[PDB]
Design a binder for this molecule. Structure first.
Ligand SMILES: CC(=O)N[C@@H]1[C@@H](O)[C@H](O[C@@H]2O[C@H](CO)[C@@H](O[C@@H]3O[C@H](CO)[C@@H](O[C@@H]4O[C@H](CO)[C@@H](O)[C@H](O)[C@H]4[N+](C)(C)C)[C@H](O)[C@H]3NC(C)=O)[C@H](O)[C@H]2NC(C)=O)[C@@H](CO)O[C@H]1O
Ligand SMILES: CC(=O)N[C@@H]1[C@@H](O)[C@H](O[C@@H]2O[C@H](CO)[C@@H](O[C@@H]3O[C@H](CO)[C@@H](O[C@@H]4O[C@H](CO)[C@@H](O)[C@H](O)[C@H]4[N+](C)(C)C)[C@H](O)[C@H]3NC(C)=O)[C@H](O)[C@H]2NC(C)=O)[C@@H](CO)O[C@H]1O
Lengths: 572, 572
């Protein structure tokens, strides 16, 4: 049948009221009410610049939307792909199984890309845009998107799609009549880390994630493609690593698949950034090389922090030949990235000391066998690895390492430099290492475990109880976690943030729930850096969850739908 | 390419070993190793009777499996449907995108249903079966399932499908050669509670849940189809309840849909048991009847424990007319159930005292307005409701109520009797109410919140932080929760158990993850009541998760796949 209710704005909340026939006032559908009742309407993220949505809606004919590219260039194929997708994005306004009446105004969308040859990812890229919507003549609409680059332009198309609403009372597709918006992201790096080594993720699932990322303007996909558990990456040069390494012959990422993901990503404004974690977090795939130590060493608690143990043996010269090949193979298919992630997490001293070949190597270099000794070995490794990385990508590009014993701010300059290395923070956001790093000039990516570890809260995977970083981190917490607060005066050194989904307890099946809608909170916090808190964004967050579900994403459910329909009744 | 590894049983663990060519020993694929390395092989749940799996496997031709029904009867259509499904169940052994070679033995499956007219659900039904597998002649296999009823027989088919394994080294479909199994469930009621009022669940999603339930022999689906938030149930007699009540016109359960679910359930050995929660947990749909009080009362914390508030007004005579109609409409489409759930949870005293009509009613009956007064009103309501329920189902059938203030063992006999009412326990398993109830003769269904609330652990839905019953309950905890321990000598009074998925934070999108594989732990605990603990069942639990994923269920991920491939390395 037909919707029985209507909604009316009262003090910023849309209140459900009976749609009684004896009325001269036109009834508002729920989304139509939310669009003007809300300070930012239905947008996510909210814009940083002008956010004028006017007061009215116009009826639109879905079959009459046409996109026009004003300036041609090298990005033509991308701009064209993006335009094509736009209609599909508009249909997201409409609930599945619902059909709009094909009547109303025609929409002309004009795309103005001011530097149409530009298509490289960089920390310095311009993701800004201007959006204006206004009536044109009598039966049509002028939607104009003006941007400095394709990336900004695509972001604008994303915002524009959000400006459509379906009236399920009348079955009309509607559009906000007069719009003036200008926008740009606060932070350049807005990412998600996906661990595809602890469990395999289908490439279809990866692409789906990228679509959702695009929907909320996240721009970086960090592919942690290797670990001790498996080696899915198809390295042509050193094929045994994958052959021995993979969970199965099927559970692999071929050169053709990666290229598919990288392009799908580029079309959607998302950098696909690969990681080769070293010298720890290696195991499977390395058998018979004699290039690792402690693989599957028991008891595991003695030698590492999760099974199975395994580290690279930095004393072996052939190792650098393998790395050089791996890095080269990665560089070939990950050809949009401007950055390389080298891991650097959790190197185990015991594990290195249990090796004879290694102890023998150190005795010959005059180094002792104490912990400060081991840092010497780690640097020796990192310096050589780094050389190979530069060679593979054919240039010196910024490298990322996790916070660790090596990266402690007190001695970090002994090993690295702030120009060459970006540091990824997984400590608490209140840890001293952060300020100390910042004072030394280091750029950071925030992944603090207390707010940004998407894996936390489930059952234990070793033993019983719950996982290491429990409890489960709610969206309220992710939204309120602010890099600006964490870094203060050094804010400009914060490149941005990244949500982490480690996969000890995640795969293809759970990936949609783990990331959405929580990653959307990160997305707003990074794009806009609101002074405001989670409660101010709550209604919009409920809507965006609904949108992800419309997209086919199996998003986590946040509240009862009754709450979404009845703003303000559900609080605490 | 091809699998590179092989597995070998050593001390109950299958160890991954290189499949080296210079060997005279035939290589074992992972599942083939697990089948005999494990005490119960790949079965879930493990059987209670004979569990002899022999030592060998035979190659089978998938296209040559034929099912024969030996005894005809009223259950013919069911037996026939079940047989048809069997081939599909066997294909689950085979990973998607993999094809077995069509060679090997032909399998004859003989179904012997000893009481082929029997198809009613009851607490007393015989779910037992006998299963024997042995070679027949030279090129074929005799698989014989012998059971007292169709329900037992279907359970046997389920066990038999589990006896197939795919050799992905050779691409051969295999079957355990000599099997002797006899089995029966420890407890008659093995359920899942699904809350479809707090959020809507697509009927496709409901059916999918039933398939997974069937896979592990759960037999009861408790459909909590109404609450304060919505009224999805399509009641022909009182249509405004759904019309006003539903989240949308689409989000409704029609008579045709319910019948579809009820039959899909009956075919799969699952009772579909509806709940009409009263007198609390009512709201939406009741507008303009004047039959409720406190709907949306603010502040909500004063009048209920979750928004929105709302209770039935028991003083209104017309109320019983509505209930009678609702119960009748439920009875018509839920025509396989032998039991009715009437709710009885969380009645609010304040909410009743805020009503004038109600206070006026009590003053006239000589009752005071203290809390013991209110219990009088609740019973008055429950007694009348109960009369309508009997009338609707046309017989006196057992009724279920939650543990509550009414059901406190100290005064319970003042209100109910142990013959007429089953009590559903959501308290901790160590709460005194349990023993006290048991001592008074009451039958119970265990849903203790500390072990069996599937909703717990996520973010808060009102305010911030985490939900009320956090932390997240892991499968280890569900498995170890034992009704036999909880009830001791009174065990026979425990009808069984039920996993609860309340839906404040769950819907169609999250339903697979919320239930699986955790509900499988409940399934084993209820079917077998093992003396053993979770660690003893761990490898099998990993396999069953994989099976649910093969089924198309988006099961939660429990551990790294590396762990599944490398038994014993991952522990704590
Ligand atoms: C069983 C138990 O509870 N034992 C207690 C412990 O409370 C206590 O210390 C705990 O020991 C655990 C090691 O078994 C530590 O767990 C590990 O924590 C690390 C992070 O420090 C995890 O690795 C990182 O995080 C992600 C996963 O979120 C992982 O994928 C990444 O590789 C990694 N990096 C982000 C750094 C790249 C690791 O997975 C996890 N291992 C597990 C759970 O098996 C735990 O941190 C530690 N807790 C504390 C508070 O120190 C123990 C002393 O060891 O004492 C026992 O009584
Ligand atoms: C915000 C906060 O943390 N406030 C604290 C509280 O610790 C403290 O008491 C808590 O008050 C909450 C009421 O707002 C209680 O939450 C409610 O708990 C009931 C169970 O008792 C939940 O209903 C049952 O459970 C399922 C959901 O799992 C539900 O769908 C069912 O309808 C129902 N039944 C199974 C019985 C049928 C209810 O959903 C939940 N409501 C929420 C979360 O909004 C909480 O139980 C209570 N905790 C304790 C330990 O008492 C408060 C005093 O009120 O003080 C504050 O400082």
């Amino acid at each position: 049948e037909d919707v029985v209710w209507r909604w009316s704005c009262d003090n910023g909340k849309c209140v459900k009221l009976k749609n009684d026939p004896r009325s001269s006032e036109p009834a508002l559908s729920l989304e139509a009410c939310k669009m003007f009742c809300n300070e930012y309407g239905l947008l996510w993220p909210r814009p940083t610049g002008e956010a004028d949505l006017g007061n009215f809606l116009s009826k639109i004919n879905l079959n009459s939307i046409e996109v026009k590219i004003l300036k041609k260039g090298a990005t033509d194929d991308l701009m064209e792909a993006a335009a094509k997708r736009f209609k599909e994005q508009v249909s997201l306004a409409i609930p599945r199984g619902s059909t709009p009446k094909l009547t109303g105004k025609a929409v002309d969308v004009y795309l103005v890309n001011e530097n149409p040859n530009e298509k490289a990812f960089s920390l310095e890229m311009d993701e800004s845009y201007g959006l204006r919507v206004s009536p044109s003549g009598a039966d049509r609409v002028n939607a104009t998107i003006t941007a400095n680059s394709f990336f900004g332009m695509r972001h604008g198309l994303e915002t524009l799609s959000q400006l459509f609403v379906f009236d399920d009372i009348r079955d009309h597709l509607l559009m906000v009549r007069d719009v003036n918006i200008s926008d740009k992201p606060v932070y350049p790096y807005r990412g998600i880390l996906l661990d595809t080594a602890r469990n395999y993720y289908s490439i279809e699932s990866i692409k789906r994630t990228i679509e959702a990322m695009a929907a909320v303007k996240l721009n970086t996909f960090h592919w942690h493609i290797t670990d001790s558990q498996s080696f899915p990456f198809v390295t042509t040069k050193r094929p045994n690593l994958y052959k021995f390494g993979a969970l199965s012959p099927q559970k692999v990422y071929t050169k053709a698949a990666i290229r598919e993901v990288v392009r799908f990503g580029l079309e959607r404004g998302v950098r696909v950034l690969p990681e080769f974690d070293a010298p720890a977090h290696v195991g499977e795939g390395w058998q018979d090389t004699d290039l690792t130590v402690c693989f599957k060493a028991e008891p595991w608690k003695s030698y590492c922090v999760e099974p199975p143990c395994g580290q690279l043996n930095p004393t072996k010269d052939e190792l650098y030949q393998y790395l050089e090949d791996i890095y080269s193979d990665m560089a070939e298919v990950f050809d949009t990235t401007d950055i390389f992630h080298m891991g650097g997490d959790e190197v185990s001293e015991a594990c290195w000391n249990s090796s004879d070949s290694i102890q023998n190597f150190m005795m010959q270099n005059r180094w002792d066998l104490d912990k400060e000794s081991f840092l010497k070995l780690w640097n020796y490794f990192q310096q050589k690895a780094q050389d190979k990385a530069y060679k593979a990508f054919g240039k010196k590009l910024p490298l990322i390492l996790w916070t660790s014993t090596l990266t402690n701010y007190k001695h970090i300059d002994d090993y690295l430099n702030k120009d060459d290395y970006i540091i990824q923070v997984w400590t608490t956001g209140v840890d001293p290492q952060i300020k100390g790093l910042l004072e030394k000039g280091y750029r950071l990516i925030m992944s603090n475990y207390d707010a940004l570890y998407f894996d936390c809260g489930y059952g234990a995977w070793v033993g019983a109880g719950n996982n290491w970083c429990s409890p489960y981190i709610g969206w309220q917490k992710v939204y309120d976690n602010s890099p600006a607060v964490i870094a203060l005066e050094h804010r400009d050194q914060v490149l941005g943030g990244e949500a982490a989904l480690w996969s000890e307890q995640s795969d293809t099946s759970t990936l949609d729930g783990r990331l959405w809608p929580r990653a959307a909170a990160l997305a707003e916090r990074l794009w806009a850096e609101p002074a405001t808190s989670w409660q101010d964004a709550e209604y919009r967050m409920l809507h965006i969850r609904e949108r992800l579900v419309r997209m086919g994403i199996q998003a986590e459910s946040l509240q009862p739908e009754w709450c979404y329909q009845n703003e303000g009744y559900c609080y605490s």
